[PDB]
Amino acid sequence: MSFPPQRYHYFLVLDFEATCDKPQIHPQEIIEFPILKLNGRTMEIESTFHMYVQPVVHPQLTPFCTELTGIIQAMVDGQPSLQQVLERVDEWMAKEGLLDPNVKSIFVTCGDWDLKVMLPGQCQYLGLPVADYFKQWINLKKAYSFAMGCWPKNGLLDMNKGLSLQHIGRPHSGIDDCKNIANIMKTLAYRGFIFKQTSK
Ligand SMILES: Nc1ncnc2c1ncn2[C@@H]1O[C@H](COP(=O)(O)O)[C@@H](O)[C@H]1O
Ligand SMILES: [Mn+2]
Ligand SMILES: [Mn+2]
Structure with a gap:
């Protein structure tokens, strides 16, 4: 097969x-919150959410952080904090039609860290409840391991290597990492893979 039917109407790359x-x-x-909404069958990008977030506990970005992410101070200054961004996310979900119980969608991340550690950890710190759609997800490294029969060593870069894909954009940019995840997914689906929730 190639681009088989999938179990979800949309994949949300984060x-x-x-x-x-x-x-x-x-x-x-969190200082950058990107979501790519992918067509569940074709893996094409159909919508994008992207907001920078103002950090509060450590409001000044370190030079290391800027060098690593490319995110400079003026990009986070004046931005809403995570609490407001999470409400912007919920509105974006509603307008996309993803809060419909008969529309099936699931988040996809490179690893478990984003939704197993980072978001629940900051939300608990902030005393915020975590929206239920953040509680199931697909670890792309685990799905790749089932699709290709091997464990990638260095996340996106090694997955692009095994699949002979050119890297998209700037490494360690949130939005560009999402596009690479989207591109890997399209190739896994081209090869006939059917994606499944991996989170426990
Ligand atoms: N080499 C690194 N050294 C320190 N922190 C990192 C490194 N790589 C990633 N991080 C942190 O983990 C976040 C997620 O990066 P990534 O998982 O590479 O998309 C970054 O925004 C940094 O806060
Ligand atoms: Mn990441
Ligand atoms: Mn990243």
């Missing part, structure tokens, strides 16, 4: 960037 430092800052805070 890749946070967060405050960081050498050695690691504590706690980390």
Whole structure:
């Protein structure tokens, strides 16, 4: 087969960037919140959510963080905080039609960190409830391992290598990481893979 029927109407590709430092800052805070809505059958990008987020606990970005992500201070200054961004996300979900119980969608991330560690950890820190659509997801490294029969070593770069795909955009940009995840998904579906929830 090729581009088989999938179990979901849409895939929501997500890749946070967060405050960081050498050695690691504590706690980390989300500073970039991108979502790509993919057509569930063809994997084409149909809509994009993208907001930078103002960190509060450590409001000044370290030089390491800027070097790593490309995100400069003026991009987060004046932005809403995570709480407001999470409400913007919910409105975006509603307008996309994804809050319909008969429309099936699922988040896709490179690894488990984004939705297993980063978002629940910051939300608990903030005393915010986590929306239920953030609680199931597909780990692309785990899906790739089932599709290709091997464990990639360095996330997106090694998955692009095994699939002979040219990298899209700037590494460690949240939105560009999402596009690479989208591109890998399209190739896995081209090869006939059917995606399944991996989160426990
Ligand atoms: N090499 C690194 N050193 C320190 N922190 C990192 C590194 N790579 C990623 N991070 C942190 O993890 C976040 C997610 O990056 P990634 O998982 O590569 O998309 C970044 O925004 C940083 O906060
Ligand atoms: Mn990531
Ligand atoms: Mn990233």
